[PDB]
Each structure stands twice: as structure tokens, then as C-alpha cells.
Design an enzyme around this catalytic site. Structure first.
Site, PDB file in Angstrom:
ATOM      1  N   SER A 161       0.812  -1.216   0.000  1.00  0.00           N
ATOM      2  CA  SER A 161       0.000   0.000   0.000  1.00  0.00           C
ATOM      3  C   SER A 161       0.848   1.270   0.000  1.00  0.00           C
ATOM      4  O   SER A 161       0.390   2.314   0.473  1.00  0.00           O
ATOM      5  CB  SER A 161      -0.975   0.021   1.183  1.00  0.00           C
ATOM      6  OG  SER A 161      -1.854  -1.087   1.142  1.00  0.00           O
ATOM      7  N   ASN A 286       1.920  -9.468  -5.879  1.00  0.00           N
ATOM      8  CA  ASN A 286       1.213  -9.426  -4.603  1.00  0.00           C
ATOM      9  C   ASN A 286       0.365 -10.687  -4.485  1.00  0.00           C
ATOM     10  O   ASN A 286      -0.611 -10.851  -5.222  1.00  0.00           O
ATOM     11  CB  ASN A 286       0.359  -8.165  -4.498  1.00  0.00           C
ATOM     12  CG  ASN A 286       1.187  -6.902  -4.591  1.00  0.00           C
ATOM     13  OD1 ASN A 286       1.751  -6.445  -3.598  1.00  0.00           O
ATOM     14  ND2 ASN A 286       1.277  -6.338  -5.791  1.00  0.00           N
TER      15      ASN A 286
HETATM   16  N1  LIG Z   1      11.085   2.199  -9.655  1.00  0.00           N
HETATM   17  C1  LIG Z   1       9.993   2.998  -9.681  1.00  0.00           C
HETATM   18  N2  LIG Z   1       9.833   3.948 -10.626  1.00  0.00           N
HETATM   19  C2  LIG Z   1       8.749   4.743 -10.654  1.00  0.00           C
HETATM   20  N3  LIG Z   1       7.745   4.669  -9.761  1.00  0.00           N
HETATM   21  C3  LIG Z   1       7.776   3.761  -8.760  1.00  0.00           C
HETATM   22  C4  LIG Z   1       8.928   2.855  -8.664  1.00  0.00           C
HETATM   23  N4  LIG Z   1       8.714   2.065  -7.599  1.00  0.00           N
HETATM   24  C5  LIG Z   1       7.527   2.433  -7.057  1.00  0.00           C
HETATM   25  N5  LIG Z   1       6.969   3.444  -7.746  1.00  0.00           N
HETATM   26  C6  LIG Z   1       5.673   4.084  -7.430  1.00  0.00           C
HETATM   27  O1  LIG Z   1       5.288   3.727  -6.099  1.00  0.00           O
HETATM   28  C7  LIG Z   1       4.117   2.906  -6.129  1.00  0.00           C
HETATM   29  C8  LIG Z   1       4.209   1.796  -5.097  1.00  0.00           C
HETATM   30  O2  LIG Z   1       5.344   0.980  -5.375  1.00  0.00           O
HETATM   31  P1  LIG Z   1       5.261  -0.577  -4.995  1.00  0.00           P
HETATM   32  O3  LIG Z   1       4.235  -1.191  -5.912  1.00  0.00           O
HETATM   33  O4  LIG Z   1       6.653  -1.155  -4.926  1.00  0.00           O
HETATM   34  O5  LIG Z   1       4.626  -0.467  -3.521  1.00  0.00           O
HETATM   35  P2  LIG Z   1       3.642  -1.549  -2.847  1.00  0.00           P
HETATM   36  O6  LIG Z   1       3.281  -0.951  -1.514  1.00  0.00           O
HETATM   37  O7  LIG Z   1       4.266  -2.920  -2.894  1.00  0.00           O
HETATM   38  O8  LIG Z   1       2.331  -1.505  -3.802  1.00  0.00           O
HETATM   39  P3  LIG Z   1       1.018  -2.425  -3.568  1.00  0.00           P
HETATM   40  O9  LIG Z   1       0.098  -1.621  -2.687  1.00  0.00           O
HETATM   41  O10 LIG Z   1       0.462  -2.611  -4.957  1.00  0.00           O
HETATM   42  O11 LIG Z   1       1.559  -3.677  -2.915  1.00  0.00           O
HETATM   43  C9  LIG Z   1       4.050   2.351  -7.540  1.00  0.00           C
HETATM   44  O12 LIG Z   1       2.714   2.046  -7.936  1.00  0.00           O
HETATM   45  C10 LIG Z   1       4.638   3.478  -8.355  1.00  0.00           C
HETATM   46  O13 LIG Z   1       3.636   4.465  -8.611  1.00  0.00           O
HETATM   47 CS   LIG Z   2       4.727  -7.922  -2.662  1.00  0.00          CS
HETATM   48 MG   LIG Z   3       2.337  -2.154  -6.381  1.00  0.00          MG
HETATM   49 MG   LIG Z   4       3.010  -4.872  -3.220  1.00  0.00          MG
END
Ligand SMILES: Nc1ncnc2c1ncn2[C@@H]1O[C@H](COP(=O)(O)OP(=O)(O)OP(=O)(O)O)[C@@H](O)[C@H]1O
Ligand SMILES: [Cs+]
Ligand SMILES: [Mg+2]
Ligand SMILES: [Mg+2]
Ligand SMILES: Nc1ncnc2c1ncn2[C@@H]1O[C@H](COP(=O)(O)OP(=O)(O)OP(=O)(O)O)[C@@H](O)[C@H]1O
Ligand SMILES: [Cs+]
Ligand SMILES: [Cs+]
Ligand SMILES: [Cs+]
Ligand SMILES: [Mg+2]
Ligand SMILES: [Mg+2]
Lengths: 325, 325
Positions: A161, A286
Site C-alpha cells: 500500500s 502481490n
Molecule cells: N522504480 C519505480 N519507478 C517509478 N515509480 C515507482 C517505482 N517504484 C515504485 N513506484 C511508485 O510507487 C508505487 C508503489 O510501489 P510498490 O508497488 O513497490 O509499492 P507496494 O506498496 O508494494 O504496492 P502495492 O500496494 O500494490 O503492494 C508504484 O505504484 C509506483 O507508482
Molecule cells: Cs509484494
Molecule cells: Mg504495487
Molecule cells: Mg506490493
């Protein structure tokens, strides 16, 4: 065939509230008789009516029963763990259900632990030939070594998130972003920021050999796909099917199913992608995606002809297909 | 001595008897008051005197208490999971102990699951630049695609004590070797066989700053280091230190400590190496090595100046200094 599902939600991770929202979505559409058990933020469980009260309050800070709960497991045929993040999506709860002998929805111990770690999953996927963003891992207390230029994204390795994620423009700000990430995990990842970037998502349904949903694209006006954008209604736009080139859709689905197979995921996963300068990058898998009102996984399979109750029915059924093996 | 340790041995894996043998070795030398709990081959637990009785029998086919057992967990400061193989060494019991909040010896959930999977651990090691034997993963019900020529070594992906492992000479024999391996796991690895080969093993001890034991070598006249050779006394030649030239021994320790950090192990590990035509290959990493009378891990550290009781004492202290972190 007799079927009674136990749904577990809440949890101690920062996504505790998101988990209860997912539980309400699943309860509203699951076609089986389903009881709810809630893990409160203190780690103690709420059972029966007290679990439903906590679901209505959309937050359970304190629970009743210390682990392990005095739950009448024999009454249920499949357990549906809906615990996003640490101690729920990372294989720890899955290990308990394995020793319990109960069939359970979603990835096993290995696939859950490896998909939850943004460093380990990227190690495996990169070796497998899946394109990934340049990244490094930082252990809490070690000095970071980032062999590429900013902007960065700094993340807790176990996050969901977008909790604890920072976009870093200057090296002066790396220290504060790492200190934020280290509030949620002993390990952090630093990734090269793709800017501008398009975000693609595709659902997978199945045991190891998955079935791919249509590809969807997420759009938003915030700087990045952060917490408020993810769960405030209207902020996130989902375009299904994603406006992609002839063939780009198939490559996204092929990478998702490849990563799914290599990591050995069972049940489900939402696989997220980055599209930047025509290049595809697999962001993350996920294993327990959100089922909140603004979540994308049910909408992705909705567009693929798998309605919300049918999706939940297939998830419970896949749990038994693996257990009956 | 105020400290009290709970030792868990047995398990439902094929290494059930090996685990009981390891328990006798640890109980004989551990300097803290230790209670034993035995997981019988049917998954039900034995406590107190019935667990000691199963130990003298060296096999526990049936248990008494179904999981979760009515064990007074609060009596014990540290839990020592001495369960080799499935449902003990692969993260399942670790996740249970995490939810219990108990400090425990050995690697966590993610590193346990990763190191047990001979495919996923090889992918991570290869991505870090650690030399490994060329291999391929074969899923059950999926035709094999082996890009190298026999002789092969076919193994279940999550196995120990050489159970289900076959040395293969002709592609006509691969399917029967895969059929045996699929009796123990839904996934198998087919590795390129090294012949001739010398087998080198090193113990690692620590959480953040792992230190290596002296290098040892295993020699045998049997076709490969199989189950009978590993645990029949006098059958295997355990040479500590290995008769190698110092530069090779230092390189083995360097690789073992690198793989230890790469895979995220804490507590302990025995790292197995192959030496063939002057080249080192990392075979596997075992997070719960055997402590049987014919086992390599305790001996390796006695040779390095760490007596058997001191080794176990440091395993328990490391479990506490990780928990407090
Ligand atoms: N390498 C990157 N380049 C550009 N934007 C990024 C990158 N990594 C993350 N982001 C931005 O941050 C957001 C969250 O990253 P990530 O999906 O790794 O987090 P998460 O908490 O695992 O997401 P989720 O809630 O889907 O599990 C992404 O949707 C993107 O908008
Ligand atoms: Cs994950
Ligand atoms: Mg994500
Ligand atoms: Mg995730
Ligand atoms: N690629 C190979 N080349 C030569 N010999 C091999 C190869 N793979 C396995 N062997 C032989 O088979 C034995 C068992 O292999 P491996 O160590 O992978 O099994 P294991 O059950 O994980 O072992 P352990 O009991 O140490 O966990 C090895 O000791 C070695 O003698
Ligand atoms: Cs990297
Ligand atoms: Cs192993
Ligand atoms: Cs390979
Ligand atoms: Mg092994
Ligand atoms: Mg071995």
C-alpha cells in the site's frame, strides 16, 4: 459437497485497515457460508460477533485471544487468509495453516515469503530473465550504496500500500527516506525511479500454472501511486484493457505467468508492471491483493469474464485442488 | 542455570528419523536445561516423557496431541527447531514460532523457504555471482527440457538426506528418476552430474557477521553420498580439514560466507561445495544441518576451536541477540 470458509483479516502490518476493507469486499460476494476471524493490531484475535464488530469499526487496535486462538478449526473446510503485508502475506501465517492441516487460499510459505521481499523477488526474477528496475538492498544500520543516479524510490522491502515509500530527488534526502523505510522493515530497497512511467497490472488465477486476466493500466494525478491515491475513491482510474501496442499486452501477460510459475505461486497474485520509454519492467507480485472498493484485482478478472463471486469460488476451489494433491 | 530451551525433533518429512538422531546429539551436549517435543510422522505431537520414549525408539509413527500442541510455550526462552526437511526446515515451523513471538535458532521464514528449494536458492546464488552446477527445474506433469547432456542428478526440489535423488546416465532413465522425485515434491531439479567430484562442506555461525568453520571433505566408495552412506556409522570418511591446498580452502570459506549473506541466513548453516577439475561449485545450503553421530556440522566447529556445548550455546545466544534486535 460441504463447504464452510473461515476468513481471516486485520493483522499487525501497516495494512491492517486495508485488510478489513478487503474482508468486507470478500464477504459481500463470496458464495459460501463464511465466518470472519480478525487479527487485531496487538496480535490478539477477535472471534465470532466481536470479529464482526471490529469489521464494522474498520479498525481493531486490540484483540481478545493471544495466538494461537481457540478457534474451532474443524468447523471450516477452507481458510481464506486476507492479511496484507507482514505476518500474513509473507508465509508466516501460511506456515501455521500448513501445520494445522487446513486447506488455505493463496500462495504457500515459500511463494509468499519470496514475493513479499522486494529484494529477493527481484533477485529471482532477474536471474529468470524477467526485466526489473535497477535496485539495491540496504540493511538497517549499513551505509547505502546506490550505483545509479537519482531520482530514486526508497521502500521497505516488505511493504504494501505504498507505506514508507519515498521518491528521492537529491542524495541529501536519501538518509531521511531510508529512516522512513526502516520504521517498517530491517531491510530497504532503493530503486531507480522511472519518470515518466506508466503502471500496468494483470491478475493471475491458478496454481503455479496461472490464467492471466486482461491487462489494466492505472492513472492518477498524484506524484506517485501512494496510499491516499490507492484507497480514496475516484483518485485512481483503471483503464481495461490497457491502451497498449499490438503485442505489448501479450508480453505483459507472458511475463506475469512466467514469474508466477518460477516463484510457484498458488491461488492468485496481482502482478504490477512499469512501462517507461517503451520498456517493460516487472514491479512486484502481490500474493494477497486488495479486495477494497478501489482495488484492481477483482476488476481485472471482471473484465476477463470472471465475475466477483466466481473469482472467490475459484480461489476456494484452488485451495482444495492443491490440498487434495 | 535459569535458561530453558525447547528442542523440537521428529517431523513429517522423510528425515523424521534423522531429526530424532540429531536431537540425541544436541540433548547430549547442550549446556542449558532442555525439554524435548517430538512431532510424530502423522503430525501429532508427543510431550514430556512420551517424547523421550520416542527418542529411545528412534522413530515416532503416531503422536498424541494434534497441532497446535498444548505446550506451555512461556516456560522456554529459546526454541530450537531441529526438524530437517519439509514442515520444519522450509519456513513453516518458523512462521509458527514467529506468531508465537518465541526466539528460535536458525534462519527465518524467508531464508528457510529459499534455502530448502534447490531451484530458487540456485537462482539467487547465480544472480549474486556464486558458481553453481548447471541445472533446470522440472514441474510435475510437465515434460522435461534439459539443455545439457547426461549424466544427471535428479532431486526433489525440497529434499534432504539424499531422499529421492537419482544418478541418471541416459535420457531413457530420466522419466523414472523424475517419477521417484515427484513422490516427494511437485517440483524437481535436474543437475549436470560432476564426475569425478570432491565434496567439501563448511559450517557457518552467526547472524550479521557469520564466521566460517574449517573446510571439511566427505569421501565414500558408494556411487554418491546417499542416505545409507550418510547415516550408517563408519560408511563415510569425514576429513577435517580437507586435504586441499590452502588457497582452495580460503576460497571455499569466502564463498560460503558470501552465500550466507546473499541468502539471508542467520544462526547457522552448512554449505556444501563441489570441487571438479579445479572449479568450485556451491551445491546447497542447509539451515538445519544434522547433529547425528555421522554429521559434519558439529565436527567442523570442534576442529575450529568451538566445542560441541559452546556451539549450541552460541546458537541459543544468537537466537536471543536477533530477537532483541
Ligand atoms: N522504480 C519505480 N519507478 C517509478 N515509480 C515507482 C517505482 N517504484 C515504485 N513506484 C511508485 O510507487 C508505487 C508503489 O510501489 P510498490 O508497488 O513497490 O509499492 P507496494 O506498496 O508494494 O504496492 P502495492 O500496494 O500494490 O503492494 C508504484 O505504484 C509506483 O507508482
Ligand atoms: Cs509484494
Ligand atoms: Mg504495487
Ligand atoms: Mg506490493
Ligand atoms: N551435480 C552433482 N554432481 C555430483 N554429485 C552430486 C550432484 N548433485 C548431487 N550429488 C550427490 O548427491 C548427494 C546429495 O545431493 P544434495 O546435497 O543436493 O542432497 P541433499 O539431500 O540436499 O543433501 P543433505 O542431506 O546434505 O541436505 C551429494 O552429496 C552428492 O554426493
Ligand atoms: Cs541488484
Ligand atoms: Cs537445503
Ligand atoms: Cs538454469
Ligand atoms: Mg540439503
Ligand atoms: Mg547436501
Amino acid at each position: 459437497m460441504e463447504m464452510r470458509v473461515l476468513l481471516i483479516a486485520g493483522g499487525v502490518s501497516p495494512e491492517h485497515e486495508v485488510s478489513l476493507l478487503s474482508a468486507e469486499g470478500v464477504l459481500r460476494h463470496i458464495p459460501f457460508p463464511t465466518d470472519l476471524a480478525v487479527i487485531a493490531q496487538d496480535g490478539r484475535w477477535l472471534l465470532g460477533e466481536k470479529a464482526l464488530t471490529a469489521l464494522e469499526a474498520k479498525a481493531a487496535p486490540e484483540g481478545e485471544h493471544p495466538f494461537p486462538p481457540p478457534l474451532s478449526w474443524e468447523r471450516y473446510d477452507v481458510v481464506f487468509p486476507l492479511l496484507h503485508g507482514r505476518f500474513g502475506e509473507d508465509g508466516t501465517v501460511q506456515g501455521f495453516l500448513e501445520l494445522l492441516g487446513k486447506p488455505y487460499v493463496g500462495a504457500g510459505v515459500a511463494a509468499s515469503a519470496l514475493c513479499m521481499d522486494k529484494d529477493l523477488s527481484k533477485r529471482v526474477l532477474a536471474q529468470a530473465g524477467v526485466p526489473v528496475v535497477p535496485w539495491v538492498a540496504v540493511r538497517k544500520g549499513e551505509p547505502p550504496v546506490v550505483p545509479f543516479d537519482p531520482p530514486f524510490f526508497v521502500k521497505p522491502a516488505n511493504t504494501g500500500s505504498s507505506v514508507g515509500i519515498s521518491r528521492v530527488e537529491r542524495f541529501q534526502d536519501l538518509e531521511a527516506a531510508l529512516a522512513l523505510a526502516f520504521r517498517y522493515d530491517e531491510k530497504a530497497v532503493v530503486e531507480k525511479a522511472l519518470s515518466p512511467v506508466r503502471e500496468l497490472e494483470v491478475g493471475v488465477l491458478g496454481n503455479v500454472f496461472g490464467e492471466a486476466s486482461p491487462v489494466g493500466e492505472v492513472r492518477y494525478e498524484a506524484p506517485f501511486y501512494d496510499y491516499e491515491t490507492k484507497y480514496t475513491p475516484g483518485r485512481a482510474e483503471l483503464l481495461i484493457p490497457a491502451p497498449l501496442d499490438p503485442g505489448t499486452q501479450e508480453t505483459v501477460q507472458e511475463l506475469a505467468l512466467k514469474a508466477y510459475k518460477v516463484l510457484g505461486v498458488r491461488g492468485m497474485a496481482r502482478v504490477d508492471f512499469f512501462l517507461a520509454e517503451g520498456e517493460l519492467y516487472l514491479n512486484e507480485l502481490n500474493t494477497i491483493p486488495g479486495f477494497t472498493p478501489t482495488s484492481m484485482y477483482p476488476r481485472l478478472f471482471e473484465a476477463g469474464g470472471v465475475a466477483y463471486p466466481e473469482l472467490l469460488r475459484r480461489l476456494v476451489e484452488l485451495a482444495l485442488t492443491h490440498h487434495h494433491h
